[PDB]
Design a protein around this ligand. Structure first.
Ligand SMILES: O=C(CNc1ccc(F)cc1)N[C@@H](C(=O)NO)c1ccc(Br)cc1
Ligand SMILES: [Zn+2]
Length: 888
């Protein structure tokens, strides 16, 4: 069954009240549910059809009269159909009692057991796995929820709303009743039961001075890892108050970590539930990346309280309205908290590698898709991250003052209601009219960002008249036709620009955002005293392919002297890309023609000089420095090469890295040594509330330089690697494992770091990732060793993803020409699909570029995908995903 956006129609039914009794027992959970329902104005006498997946019916009733299977209803394990003639014409009560089995629910959707915690996940379609419902987000209802369980095993009981009763039950059990009067969609329902330990705090809101109790929960073993999450929650609350003027509306907010989770976290109202790897950290037992991850995921789920929970979705095709907008709010928050330029750069780096790949793949879709089979397949980097860039462009176009005015219009007008992408565009249009001082101004063209798939390409030509002091930027935009639009239309593209004087590095014009609304336009600037170098798409102001048409000399000047971090990073990126494409084609030709000798174009010496200049600048940023010594990501590069031969690309990267290191290794080594004191400072190692993002960026730089020096076999660098392995910081000692891959000490450090990791669940997963992405010639034997000794039969998604996904980024080995790496991941996908279709589809990620590779590897990947598709037991999720990916 294919659902189409244009087919939306309101239900013929209304569910006003849900009264749940969830009785948890060792071998089963009994769910009783009374739904106080009505007939809506759209009803036309149809059957009453409920969603209900995998439920064991004990009984169902209408108005306390038990219904008879076969004559009055059918149930096919997916839909409960009550025939029209037995459906009442006015207000009525539907009731049911079903049995479900959280303990064997390894798909982690619906109600399931994670270690010793019972927990739910209802977005998008999981509530129907708990009880019968019209399981779609426009069915808003009140919830009164009672949970009972063995008290010894499950002392802590949580659901949405206020706890209004706690009571004892004979036989060692107990119950708690939660009443949540405000309307909500069923995907925001949640329940948690377990032997949970907590940290707590009281937050007083900014304007109404309301006292909000904050609780963060985990299993007892890891309760000492909760402190940063609680601090991040306070920060998120303050940011929504300070930037958006928005306070929390409930008396309490609970965050709960669980070990088994399909994604990062979930915004259930007042009861946010997290993958443990996105809530728990300590400085002894977590890598640095955990701190930014917890900050952004806590922030993300908090910002949903307005953008998703208070203003909700009419239908799932509007997903980007809450996810793109919440990622945008998340990104603003992160940028303000970290105060590092690499925060924005890391978002752009993600979009232009992963999301651009998706947008040029057969899976390409607009941020508001037109159809789906499994809605879980459209929680994508397109909907989330391109969605966020589309939400960010409103702020770029409007400026902070009018953006905040438009955002508040959207909140005030839609608070407590469902909404669509048009409602948001409407609110921004009102601010646009105010800003332009023109009630005729509109953003109708802006809506194409929601409906048009594919990445626009923006290219430039320039003219400077020295006598007239007149400078022109000619701009073109183009989107390649794809399967979603045969004809692509020009978008509203905001181009943040500066003009740099190449003689002194100074700004030449005030802040300027060009509004490109046609296929092409010419923007002219008068009184430009000298020929400038244009600084284009500052802040990465639109999600596009930038073709700057600048010389490498011009790009070097921007890299050294521009004020905008993104344009400097992009100029570096563009210099690298020109070099990569040139050397790639030289290696390819020598391979194709079987040349006994040939030449390679060297790396630009003035570019290497500029890198050295930046690295040696003690006032320059360490995080930015780590980006400039790193080549662009493989998944960024592959968007620019047809029939990419992964071995030739590996040879290209190796040549270019060797070229630069042959000049700069002594600089790299000197910096690695001089950065030690500040990077590894232990002053606050035992203060979990003290997080220094610049210090972590200095560690990133040290660990990047160490990797470069180790690959280069720099003299006696093994000494530094061994010393690095004794650092108290996991980012450092796990780096010592991966860079030791090039030395005879690798398995010594393998065993040392395993011993350091094995007694913390999350640290062990970081160790698994480090092994998985180790640059080892024997990586296939090493993966078998992880399988046999550590991973075993685990159904934990964090374990499976840790063992296999980093390995898939091994350009030389995963893409082994035998196809053995494709075969290995396909076996893992098919095995995983038997119990967790969502994670099976996540493990398909390496196949997304299949039609971008050389002909032999295309065929090898296609064969494994077609083998996967022929599996008799394949899930709907995996089948739909592979059918779309293979154009079948
Ligand atoms: O957690 C994420 C993204 N991060 C992530 C991390 C590791 C992974 F393996 C996968 C995803 N998204 C949340 C979300 O949006 N919460 O607000 C979400 C919620 C429900 C559904 Br259905 C899908 C996605
Ligand atoms: Zn979200």
């Amino acid at each position: 069954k294919i659902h189409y956006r244009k087919d939306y129609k309101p239900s013929g039914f209304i569910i006003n009240q849900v009264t749940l009794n969830i009785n948890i027992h060792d071998q089963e959970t009994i769910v009783r549910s009374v739904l106080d329902m009505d007939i809506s104005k759209h009803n036309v006498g149809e059957d009453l059809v409920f969603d209900g997946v995998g439920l064991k019916i004990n009984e169902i009733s209408i108005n306390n009269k038990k219904l008879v299977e076969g004559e009055e209803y059918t149930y096919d394990n997916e839909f409960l159909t009550i025939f029209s003639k037995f459906v009442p014409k006015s207000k009525f009560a539907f009731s049911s009692e079903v049995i479900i089995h959280p303990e064997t629910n390894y798909a982690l959707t619906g109600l399931y057991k994670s270690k010793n915690i019972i927990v739910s996940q209802c977005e998008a379609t999981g509530f129907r796995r708990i009880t019968f419902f019209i399981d779609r987000p426009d069915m808003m209802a009140k919830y009164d929820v009672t949970v009972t369980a063995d008290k010894e095993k499950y002392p802590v009981l949580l659901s949405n709303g206020d706890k209004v009763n706690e009571f004892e039950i004979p036989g060692g059990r107990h119950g708690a009743r939660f009443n949540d009067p405000p309307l909500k969609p069923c995907y925001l329902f949640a329940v948690v039961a377990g032997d949970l330990k907590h940290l707590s705090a009281t937050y007083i809101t900014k304007y109404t001075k309301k006292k909000v109790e904050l609780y963060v929960f985990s299993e007892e073993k890891y309760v000492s890892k909760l402190q940063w999450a609680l601090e991040c929650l306070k920060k998120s609350m303050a940011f929504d108050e300070d930037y958006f003027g928005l306070e929390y509306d409930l008396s309490r907010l609970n965050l709960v970590a669980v070990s088994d989770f399909n994604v990062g976290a979930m915004e259930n109202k007042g009861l946010n539930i997290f993958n443990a790897n996105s809530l728990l950290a300590s400085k002894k037992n977590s890598i640095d990346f955990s701190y930014a991850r917890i900050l952004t995921v806590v922030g993300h789920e908090y910002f949903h309280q307005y953008t998703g929970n208070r203003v909700t979705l009419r239908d799932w095709f509007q997903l980007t309205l809450k996810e793109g907008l919440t990622v945008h709010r998340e990104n603003l928050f992160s940028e303000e908290m970290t105060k590092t330029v690499t925060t924005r750069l890391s978002h752009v780096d993600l979009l232009r590698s992963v999301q651009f790949l998706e947008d040029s793949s057969p899976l390409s879709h607009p941020i508001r898709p037109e159809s789906y089979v499994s809605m879980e397949n459209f929680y994508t980097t397109t909907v989330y991250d391109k969605g966020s860039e589309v939400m960010r462009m409103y702020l770029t176009i409007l400026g902070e003052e009018y953006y905040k005015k438009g955002f508040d219009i959207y909140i005030k007008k839609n608070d407590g209601n469902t909404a669509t992408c048009e409602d948001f565009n409407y609110a921004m249009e009102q601010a646009y009219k105010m800003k332009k001082a023109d009630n005729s101004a509109n953003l109708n063209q802006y809506l194409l960002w929601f409906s048009q798939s594919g990445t626009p390409h923006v290219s430039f030509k320039y003219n400077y008249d020295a006598e007239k002091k007149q400078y022109s930027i000619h701009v073109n935009q183009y989107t390649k036709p794809d399967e979603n639009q045969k004809e692509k239309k020009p978008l509203f593209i905001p181009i943040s620009v500066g003009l740099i004087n190449p003689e002194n590095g100074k700004e030449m014009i005030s802040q300027t955002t060009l509004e490109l609304t046609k296929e092409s336009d010419t923007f002219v600037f008068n009184n430009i005293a000298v020929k400038p170098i244009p600084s284009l798409f500052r802040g990465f102001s639109a999600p596009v392919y930038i073709e700057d048409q600048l010389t490498d000399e011009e790009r070097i000047l921007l890299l050294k002297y521009d004020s905008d971090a993104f344009v400097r990073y992009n100029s570096c990126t563009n210099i690298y890309m020109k070099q990569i494409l040139m050397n790639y084609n030289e290696f390819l030709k020598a391979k194709n023609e079987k040349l006994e000798s040939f030449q390679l174009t060297p790396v630009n010496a003035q570019f290497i000089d500029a890198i050295k200049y930046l690295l040696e600048d003690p006032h320059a940023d360490a995080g930015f420095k780590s980006y400039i010594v790193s080549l662009p990501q493989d998944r960024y590069i592959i968007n620019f090469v047809s029939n990419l031969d992964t071995d030739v690309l590996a040879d290209t990267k190796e040549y270019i890295y060797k070229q630069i290191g042959d000049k700069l290794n002594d600089v790299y080594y000197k910096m690695f040594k001089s950065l030690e004191a500040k990077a590894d400072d232990l002053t606050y190692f035992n203060d979990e509330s003290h997080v220094d993002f610049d210090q972590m960026n200095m560690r990133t730089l040290r660990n990047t330089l160490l990797s470069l020096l180790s690959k280069a076999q720099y003299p006696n660098i093994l000494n530094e690697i061994i010393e690095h392995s004794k650092s108290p910081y996991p980012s450092n000692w796990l780096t010592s494992l991966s860079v030791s891959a090039y030395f005879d000490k690798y398995f010594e450090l393998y065993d040392k770091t395993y011993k350091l990791s094995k007694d913390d669940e999350l640290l062990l997963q970081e160790w698994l990732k480090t092994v998985s992405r180790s640059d080892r010639k024997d990586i296939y034997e090493i993966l078998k060793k992880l399988e046999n000794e550590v991973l075993k039969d685990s159904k934990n998604p964090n374990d499976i993803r840790a063992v296999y996904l980093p390995f898939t980024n091994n350009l030389r080995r995963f893409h082994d020409i035998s196809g053995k790496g494709y075969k290995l991941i396909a076996e893992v996908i098919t095995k995983t699909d038997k119990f967790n279709p969502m994670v099976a589809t996540q493990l398909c990620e390496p196949f997304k570029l299949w039609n971008k590779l050389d002909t032999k590897r295309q065929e090898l990947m296609l064969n494994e995908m077609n083998t996967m598709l022929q599996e008799p037991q394949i899930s709907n999720n995996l089948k739909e995903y592979l059918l779309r990916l293979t154009n079948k």
